[PDB]
Amino acid sequence: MKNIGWMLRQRATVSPRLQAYVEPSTDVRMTYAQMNALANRCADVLTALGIAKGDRVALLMPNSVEFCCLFYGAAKLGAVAVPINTRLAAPEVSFILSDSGSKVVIYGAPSAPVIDAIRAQADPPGTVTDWIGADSLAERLRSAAADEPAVECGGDDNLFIMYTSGTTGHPKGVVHTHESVHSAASSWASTIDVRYRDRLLLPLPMFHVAALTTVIFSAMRGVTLISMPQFDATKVWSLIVEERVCIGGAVPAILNFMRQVPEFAELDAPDFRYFITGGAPMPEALIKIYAAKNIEVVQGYALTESCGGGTLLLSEDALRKAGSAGRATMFTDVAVRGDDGVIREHGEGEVVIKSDILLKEYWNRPEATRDAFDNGWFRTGDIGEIDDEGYLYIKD
């Protein structure tokens, strides 16, 4: 049985003195050994707040080491973290908290007004027994034990509930387990050219599935995570050069912008190797420009339902296969469901995925869960085409 929490501990056993989290803007540079110790302290605090195996703990906060150590500590307890977008209004949060039945909510100073609001009136989520702010978490951590929790859990046990649906009805909670997450981390770690002691920049919100699995596989491979809590495209390059960043994540929007800045002119970052792109496929031009700086780019297609895992278009095909979402990667297969209910590895129809990175179920959405699956394959809801050479092209 795999356990995301225990993996953090083994990483601290293998590379105790390796840098695990570096956040310049807040002067926080921690080691794996230390991050694990902080994770243990989070576990102790969580158990003290009545959190037990299966219970949900909501996280509404800025990217930080405490965010990470909180879900890691939750992982070691067999608890379930529910990371929330810090940009949505109080009524959407309340809904998520109520839907997930979160017992405890931990929030950062900048979202205190959303909590104080949900706290003040209406029909407040009745399951929440404790609302812990930044200073309070600080205090509790100070008197928390740092020993390893002893809880037999992992494998198929729930670990994360990530909400998504943007249309109407209501948001849907994607439940992920220790295994699906472990599997997603592994897929990225074995697919891309990522190596021990690499320094990877994480500019994306920790509540996004992509950022979560990045943190996880950073720990799996022994990568020093480089953070920028408040993304500032005017300072990115400096951070990248100062902390010797080898790998970075970004949306084609950002990248295109990042090469406008005067800094870009001729920056010297011999350590930076490539950007990992999500969302919309990179255009020829945008790729050629980065290629001129010996910086390559790889792009992928993934959903929250796929734990941020999926297809990947390797750098070498960046131009030859312009707008393609890539091909299968380690441990993840892709196919297309024909309008006749038949699943083919070539042709067109609805993109489907078969991989241990897939969610277990949508949180309390029986009907939704049944339709998403078709004999082991998950239905993405995206139409696409997989050509001869096996390259995927999304349509709508």
Short mmCIF file of C-alpha atoms in Angstrom, two decimals:
data_model
loop_
_atom_site.label_atom_id
_atom_site.label_comp_id
_atom_site.label_asym_id
_atom_site.label_seq_id
_atom_site.Cartn_x
_atom_site.Cartn_y
_atom_site.Cartn_z
CA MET A 1 0.00 0.00 0.00
CA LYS A 2 1.33 3.45 -0.91
CA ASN A 3 0.97 6.47 1.37
CA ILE A 4 1.74 10.02 0.34
CA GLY A 5 2.62 10.91 3.94
CA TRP A 6 5.11 8.05 4.40
CA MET A 7 6.73 9.02 1.11
CA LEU A 8 7.59 12.42 2.58
CA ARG A 9 9.22 10.60 5.49
CA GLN A 10 11.28 8.32 3.25
CA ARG A 11 12.41 11.36 1.26
CA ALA A 12 13.52 12.89 4.55
CA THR A 13 15.35 9.61 5.27
CA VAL A 14 17.13 9.58 1.89
CA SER A 15 17.86 13.31 1.57
CA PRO A 16 17.52 14.76 5.10
CA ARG A 17 19.61 17.82 4.30
CA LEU A 18 18.30 18.47 0.81
CA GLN A 19 16.43 21.71 0.24
CA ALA A 20 12.71 20.99 -0.03
CA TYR A 21 10.99 24.38 -0.03
CA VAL A 22 12.55 27.73 -0.89
CA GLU A 23 10.37 30.86 -0.82
CA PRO A 24 12.48 34.06 -1.16
CA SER A 25 9.63 36.56 -0.73
CA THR A 26 9.10 35.23 2.80
CA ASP A 27 12.65 34.13 3.52
CA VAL A 28 11.59 30.53 4.03
CA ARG A 29 14.10 27.86 3.06
CA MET A 30 13.41 24.44 4.52
CA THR A 31 14.99 21.02 4.29
CA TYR A 32 13.15 17.79 3.64
CA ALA A 33 13.97 16.65 7.16
CA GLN A 34 12.49 19.89 8.48
CA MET A 35 9.47 19.87 6.18
CA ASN A 36 8.66 16.32 7.37
CA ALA A 37 9.03 17.46 11.00
CA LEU A 38 6.65 20.33 10.27
CA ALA A 39 4.29 17.85 8.59
CA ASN A 40 4.34 15.70 11.74
CA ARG A 41 3.57 18.78 13.82
CA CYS A 42 0.61 19.51 11.54
CA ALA A 43 -0.64 15.96 12.04
CA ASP A 44 -0.50 16.34 15.82
CA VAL A 45 -2.37 19.63 15.64
CA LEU A 46 -4.98 18.11 13.33
CA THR A 47 -5.58 15.12 15.62
CA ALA A 48 -5.86 17.56 18.53
CA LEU A 49 -8.68 19.28 16.63
CA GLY A 50 -10.64 16.02 16.42
CA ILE A 51 -9.45 15.16 12.91
CA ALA A 52 -9.32 11.39 12.27
CA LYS A 53 -9.09 8.85 9.43
CA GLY A 54 -11.56 9.91 6.74
CA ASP A 55 -12.35 13.37 8.14
CA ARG A 56 -12.04 16.36 5.80
CA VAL A 57 -9.92 19.42 6.59
CA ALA A 58 -10.37 22.45 4.34
CA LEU A 59 -7.40 24.65 3.32
CA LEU A 60 -8.13 28.26 2.24
CA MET A 61 -4.76 29.96 2.10
CA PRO A 62 -1.85 31.42 0.08
CA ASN A 63 0.77 29.03 -1.22
CA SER A 64 3.13 28.23 1.64
CA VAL A 65 5.07 25.49 3.37
CA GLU A 66 2.31 25.16 5.97
CA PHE A 67 -0.15 24.44 3.17
CA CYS A 68 2.08 21.59 2.01
CA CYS A 69 2.88 20.23 5.47
CA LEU A 70 -0.82 20.35 6.29
CA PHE A 71 -1.95 17.97 3.56
CA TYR A 72 1.19 15.88 4.17
CA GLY A 73 0.25 15.64 7.85
CA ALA A 74 -3.35 14.91 6.78
CA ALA A 75 -1.97 12.17 4.51
CA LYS A 76 -0.15 10.55 7.43
CA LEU A 77 -3.39 10.56 9.43
CA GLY A 78 -5.49 9.12 6.64
CA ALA A 79 -7.36 12.43 6.66
CA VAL A 80 -8.67 14.21 3.59
CA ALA A 81 -7.61 17.67 2.50
CA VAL A 82 -10.02 19.94 0.65
CA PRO A 83 -7.99 22.80 -0.91
CA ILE A 84 -10.12 25.75 -1.96
CA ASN A 85 -9.78 28.58 -4.42
CA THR A 86 -9.06 31.76 -2.47
CA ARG A 87 -10.64 33.81 -5.25
CA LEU A 88 -14.25 32.70 -4.95
CA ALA A 89 -16.92 34.48 -2.94
CA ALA A 90 -18.13 33.40 0.51
CA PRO A 91 -21.25 31.58 -0.80
CA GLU A 92 -19.21 29.28 -3.05
CA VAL A 93 -16.81 28.40 -0.20
CA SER A 94 -19.68 27.75 2.18
CA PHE A 95 -21.15 25.39 -0.40
CA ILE A 96 -17.89 23.48 -0.74
CA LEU A 97 -17.43 23.27 3.02
CA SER A 98 -21.00 22.05 3.38
CA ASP A 99 -20.80 19.63 0.46
CA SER A 100 -17.57 18.03 1.67
CA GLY A 101 -18.70 17.99 5.28
CA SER A 102 -15.36 19.47 6.36
CA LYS A 103 -14.81 19.19 10.11
CA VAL A 104 -12.02 21.76 10.25
CA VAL A 105 -11.21 24.82 8.16
CA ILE A 106 -7.74 26.34 8.09
CA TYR A 107 -7.45 29.75 6.42
CA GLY A 108 -4.86 32.41 5.74
CA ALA A 109 -4.95 36.06 6.75
CA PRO A 110 -6.01 37.25 3.25
CA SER A 111 -9.19 35.16 3.23
CA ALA A 112 -10.16 35.97 6.81
CA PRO A 113 -13.00 38.15 5.57
CA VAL A 114 -14.58 35.24 3.64
CA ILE A 115 -14.46 33.06 6.76
CA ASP A 116 -15.69 35.82 9.06
CA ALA A 117 -18.58 36.20 6.60
CA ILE A 118 -19.52 32.50 6.39
CA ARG A 119 -19.08 32.54 10.18
CA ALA A 120 -21.38 35.52 10.77
CA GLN A 121 -24.71 34.59 9.24
CA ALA A 122 -27.16 32.45 7.33
CA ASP A 123 -27.04 28.70 7.46
CA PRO A 124 -23.31 28.25 8.25
CA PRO A 125 -21.78 24.86 7.32
CA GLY A 126 -22.75 22.90 10.44
CA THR A 127 -19.97 20.31 10.23
CA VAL A 128 -17.11 22.76 10.83
CA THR A 129 -16.16 22.57 14.50
CA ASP A 130 -13.08 24.80 14.31
CA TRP A 131 -11.99 27.76 12.17
CA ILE A 132 -8.22 28.14 12.45
CA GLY A 133 -6.50 31.31 11.24
CA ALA A 134 -2.79 31.90 10.57
CA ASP A 135 -1.78 33.06 14.05
CA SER A 136 -3.77 30.31 15.70
CA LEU A 137 -2.11 27.67 13.49
CA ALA A 138 1.20 29.26 14.46
CA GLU A 139 0.42 28.89 18.15
CA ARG A 140 -0.85 25.31 17.92
CA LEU A 141 2.18 24.25 15.89
CA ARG A 142 4.47 25.61 18.62
CA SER A 143 3.21 23.05 21.14
CA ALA A 144 2.84 20.18 18.65
CA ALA A 145 4.78 16.91 18.71
CA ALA A 146 7.11 16.14 15.81
CA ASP A 147 7.06 12.36 16.04
CA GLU A 148 5.85 10.22 13.18
CA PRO A 149 2.15 9.37 13.41
CA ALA A 150 1.41 5.65 13.52
CA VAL A 151 -1.69 5.15 11.37
CA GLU A 152 -2.27 2.19 9.04
CA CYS A 153 -3.75 3.99 6.01
CA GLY A 154 -3.19 4.82 2.36
CA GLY A 155 -3.78 2.97 -0.88
CA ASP A 156 -7.42 3.51 -1.84
CA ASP A 157 -8.20 5.68 1.22
CA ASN A 158 -9.41 9.14 0.26
CA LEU A 159 -6.73 11.82 0.37
CA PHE A 160 -8.04 14.81 -1.64
CA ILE A 161 -11.37 16.30 -2.71
CA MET A 162 -10.89 18.85 -5.49
CA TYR A 163 -13.96 20.74 -6.76
CA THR A 164 -14.32 21.87 -10.41
CA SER A 165 -17.51 22.24 -12.49
CA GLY A 166 -17.76 25.77 -13.82
CA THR A 167 -21.08 25.74 -15.72
CA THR A 168 -24.12 25.62 -13.43
CA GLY A 169 -25.89 23.05 -11.25
CA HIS A 170 -23.06 23.18 -8.72
CA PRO A 171 -19.33 22.43 -8.34
CA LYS A 172 -18.36 18.76 -8.34
CA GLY A 173 -15.86 17.40 -5.81
CA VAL A 174 -13.18 15.16 -7.38
CA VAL A 175 -12.02 12.57 -4.84
CA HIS A 176 -8.40 11.41 -5.16
CA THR A 177 -6.63 8.72 -3.15
CA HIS A 178 -3.10 8.02 -2.01
CA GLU A 179 -2.72 5.67 -5.02
CA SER A 180 -4.14 7.88 -7.78
CA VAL A 181 -1.96 10.74 -6.52
CA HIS A 182 1.07 8.49 -6.10
CA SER A 183 0.42 7.29 -9.64
CA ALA A 184 0.09 10.82 -11.04
CA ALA A 185 3.31 11.88 -9.32
CA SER A 186 5.06 8.80 -10.71
CA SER A 187 3.78 9.46 -14.22
CA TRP A 188 5.26 12.97 -14.24
CA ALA A 189 8.45 11.86 -12.52
CA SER A 190 9.04 9.08 -15.09
CA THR A 191 7.89 11.00 -18.17
CA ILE A 192 9.77 14.31 -18.00
CA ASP A 193 13.47 14.94 -17.71
CA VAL A 194 13.38 15.72 -14.01
CA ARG A 195 16.32 14.74 -11.82
CA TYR A 196 17.39 14.56 -8.19
CA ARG A 197 18.16 17.98 -6.68
CA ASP A 198 16.58 19.82 -9.59
CA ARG A 199 15.03 23.11 -8.47
CA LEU A 200 11.48 23.54 -9.73
CA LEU A 201 9.51 26.77 -9.66
CA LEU A 202 5.86 26.58 -8.68
CA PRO A 203 4.01 29.82 -9.63
CA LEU A 204 0.54 28.21 -9.73
CA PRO A 205 -2.05 28.19 -6.87
CA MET A 206 -1.66 25.20 -4.56
CA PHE A 207 -5.41 24.59 -4.71
CA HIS A 208 -5.08 23.63 -8.40
CA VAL A 209 -4.62 19.89 -8.98
CA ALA A 210 -1.55 20.48 -11.14
CA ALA A 211 0.34 22.31 -8.38
CA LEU A 212 -0.59 19.66 -5.84
CA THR A 213 0.88 16.77 -7.80
CA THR A 214 3.94 18.89 -8.59
CA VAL A 215 4.61 19.25 -4.86
CA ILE A 216 4.04 15.55 -4.46
CA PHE A 217 6.34 14.43 -7.24
CA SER A 218 8.87 17.00 -6.11
CA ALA A 219 9.04 15.01 -2.90
CA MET A 220 9.06 11.67 -4.77
CA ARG A 221 12.11 12.66 -6.86
CA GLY A 222 13.82 14.82 -4.26
CA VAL A 223 13.31 18.18 -5.95
CA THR A 224 13.82 21.55 -4.24
CA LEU A 225 10.55 23.39 -4.69
CA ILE A 226 10.91 27.09 -5.51
CA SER A 227 7.88 29.21 -4.63
CA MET A 228 6.40 32.56 -5.59
CA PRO A 229 3.24 32.99 -3.42
CA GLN A 230 2.10 36.13 -5.24
CA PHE A 231 2.89 35.63 -8.92
CA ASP A 232 4.57 38.72 -10.39
CA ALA A 233 5.54 38.28 -14.06
CA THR A 234 7.90 41.24 -13.64
CA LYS A 235 10.09 39.39 -11.15
CA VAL A 236 9.83 35.78 -12.35
CA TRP A 237 13.10 35.77 -14.31
CA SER A 238 15.07 37.11 -11.35
CA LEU A 239 13.70 34.43 -9.06
CA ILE A 240 14.47 31.85 -11.76
CA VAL A 241 18.06 33.04 -12.03
CA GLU A 242 18.64 33.65 -8.31
CA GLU A 243 17.42 30.24 -7.14
CA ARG A 244 18.96 28.44 -10.12
CA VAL A 245 15.57 27.13 -11.27
CA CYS A 246 15.85 24.17 -13.64
CA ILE A 247 12.16 23.71 -14.37
CA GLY A 248 9.14 25.98 -14.43
CA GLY A 249 5.41 25.78 -14.99
CA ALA A 250 3.26 28.26 -16.90
CA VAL A 251 0.34 28.98 -19.24
CA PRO A 252 1.07 30.10 -22.83
CA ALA A 253 -0.35 33.46 -21.78
CA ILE A 254 2.37 33.96 -19.17
CA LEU A 255 5.24 32.71 -21.33
CA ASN A 256 4.37 35.01 -24.24
CA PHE A 257 4.46 37.86 -21.72
CA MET A 258 7.60 36.66 -19.95
CA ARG A 259 9.53 37.21 -23.19
CA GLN A 260 8.28 40.76 -23.58
CA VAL A 261 9.93 42.03 -20.39
CA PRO A 262 13.25 43.83 -20.99
CA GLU A 263 14.89 41.27 -18.71
CA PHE A 264 14.26 38.63 -21.34
CA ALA A 265 16.41 40.60 -23.81
CA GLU A 266 19.36 38.40 -23.02
CA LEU A 267 19.05 36.77 -19.64
CA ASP A 268 21.59 34.22 -18.51
CA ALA A 269 20.00 31.20 -16.85
CA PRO A 270 22.16 28.20 -17.79
CA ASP A 271 20.33 26.07 -15.20
CA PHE A 272 16.84 26.59 -16.62
CA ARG A 273 15.94 23.69 -18.91
CA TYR A 274 12.27 23.90 -19.85
CA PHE A 275 8.74 25.05 -19.07
CA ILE A 276 5.86 22.65 -18.52
CA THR A 277 2.73 24.03 -20.21
CA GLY A 278 -0.93 23.24 -19.56
CA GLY A 279 -4.14 24.51 -21.14
CA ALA A 280 -4.02 25.81 -24.73
CA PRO A 281 -1.33 24.47 -27.11
CA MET A 282 1.71 26.70 -27.65
CA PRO A 283 1.89 28.47 -31.05
CA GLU A 284 4.80 27.95 -33.47
CA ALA A 285 6.22 31.45 -32.89
CA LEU A 286 6.06 31.33 -29.10
CA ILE A 287 7.94 28.03 -29.23
CA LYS A 288 10.59 29.28 -31.67
CA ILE A 289 11.35 32.25 -29.44
CA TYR A 290 12.00 30.15 -26.35
CA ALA A 291 13.95 27.67 -28.45
CA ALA A 292 16.22 30.59 -29.41
CA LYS A 293 17.15 30.84 -25.70
CA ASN A 294 17.89 27.10 -25.52
CA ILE A 295 14.77 26.73 -23.39
CA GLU A 296 12.42 23.98 -24.50
CA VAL A 297 8.74 23.48 -23.71
CA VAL A 298 6.54 20.42 -23.27
CA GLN A 299 2.77 20.60 -23.23
CA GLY A 300 0.07 18.45 -21.76
CA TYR A 301 -3.62 17.81 -21.47
CA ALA A 302 -5.06 16.82 -18.09
CA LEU A 303 -8.08 17.31 -15.84
CA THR A 304 -8.66 17.54 -12.13
CA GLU A 305 -10.30 14.16 -12.65
CA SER A 306 -6.93 12.86 -13.92
CA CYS A 307 -5.08 14.32 -10.92
CA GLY A 308 -3.26 16.62 -13.32
CA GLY A 309 -1.92 13.67 -15.28
CA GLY A 310 -2.54 12.85 -18.91
CA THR A 311 -0.99 13.25 -22.34
CA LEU A 312 2.24 15.05 -23.11
CA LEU A 313 3.64 16.46 -26.34
CA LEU A 314 7.39 16.06 -26.07
CA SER A 315 9.60 19.05 -26.92
CA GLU A 316 10.94 17.35 -30.07
CA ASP A 317 7.43 17.37 -31.58
CA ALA A 318 6.65 20.93 -30.45
CA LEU A 319 6.63 22.22 -34.05
CA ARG A 320 6.15 19.07 -36.15
CA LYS A 321 2.90 18.50 -34.25
CA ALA A 322 1.81 22.11 -33.74
CA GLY A 323 -1.50 22.11 -31.86
CA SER A 324 -1.49 18.54 -30.52
CA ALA A 325 -2.09 17.68 -26.85
CA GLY A 326 0.52 14.93 -27.14
CA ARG A 327 0.49 11.17 -26.64
CA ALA A 328 0.18 8.69 -23.79
CA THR A 329 2.81 8.91 -21.03
CA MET A 330 4.17 6.51 -18.40
CA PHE A 331 1.22 4.71 -16.76
CA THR A 332 -1.47 6.63 -18.66
CA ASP A 333 -3.33 5.53 -21.79
CA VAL A 334 -5.66 7.56 -24.01
CA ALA A 335 -8.38 6.65 -26.52
CA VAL A 336 -11.57 7.99 -28.12
CA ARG A 337 -15.15 6.93 -27.48
CA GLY A 338 -17.10 6.75 -30.73
CA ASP A 339 -20.66 8.05 -30.93
CA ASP A 340 -21.57 4.37 -31.12
CA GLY A 341 -20.27 3.68 -27.61
CA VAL A 342 -17.14 2.00 -29.01
CA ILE A 343 -13.66 2.95 -27.75
CA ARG A 344 -10.86 3.07 -30.31
CA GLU A 345 -7.19 3.95 -30.01
CA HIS A 346 -7.43 5.87 -33.30
CA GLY A 347 -10.01 8.00 -35.02
CA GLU A 348 -12.32 10.56 -33.47
CA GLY A 349 -14.87 10.98 -30.70
CA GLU A 350 -14.78 11.73 -26.97
CA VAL A 351 -11.37 11.61 -25.32
CA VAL A 352 -11.23 8.89 -22.70
CA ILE A 353 -8.51 8.02 -20.21
CA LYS A 354 -7.52 4.76 -18.48
CA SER A 355 -4.92 5.17 -15.74
CA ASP A 356 -4.44 4.77 -12.01
CA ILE A 357 -4.25 8.55 -11.90
CA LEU A 358 -8.03 8.70 -12.28
CA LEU A 359 -10.34 9.79 -9.48
CA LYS A 360 -12.18 7.23 -7.37
CA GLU A 361 -15.51 9.06 -7.59
CA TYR A 362 -17.14 12.46 -7.56
CA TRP A 363 -17.89 13.36 -3.93
CA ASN A 364 -21.48 12.39 -3.21
CA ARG A 365 -22.58 12.45 -6.87
CA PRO A 366 -23.57 8.77 -7.57
CA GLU A 367 -25.16 9.48 -10.92
CA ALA A 368 -22.31 11.78 -12.02
CA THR A 369 -19.80 9.10 -11.07
CA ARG A 370 -21.55 6.37 -13.05
CA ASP A 371 -21.66 8.34 -16.32
CA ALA A 372 -18.04 9.43 -16.14
CA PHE A 373 -16.89 5.82 -16.35
CA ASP A 374 -17.20 3.35 -19.21
CA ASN A 375 -15.58 0.01 -18.43
CA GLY A 376 -12.41 1.40 -16.89
CA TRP A 377 -12.17 4.44 -19.15
CA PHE A 378 -12.96 7.91 -17.85
CA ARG A 379 -15.01 10.25 -20.05
CA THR A 380 -13.39 13.70 -20.15
CA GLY A 381 -16.26 15.45 -21.90
CA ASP A 382 -13.80 16.75 -24.50
CA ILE A 383 -14.14 15.88 -28.18
CA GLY A 384 -10.93 15.11 -30.03
CA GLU A 385 -9.00 13.21 -32.66
CA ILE A 386 -6.15 10.74 -32.28
CA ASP A 387 -4.30 10.35 -35.56
CA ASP A 388 -2.19 7.54 -37.01
CA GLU A 389 1.04 8.29 -35.18
CA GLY A 390 -1.10 8.43 -32.05
CA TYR A 391 -1.16 12.18 -31.52
CA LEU A 392 -4.13 13.71 -29.73
CA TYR A 393 -5.85 16.85 -30.95
CA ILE A 394 -8.58 18.37 -28.79
CA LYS A 395 -11.54 20.11 -30.45
CA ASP A 396 -14.12 21.38 -27.95
#
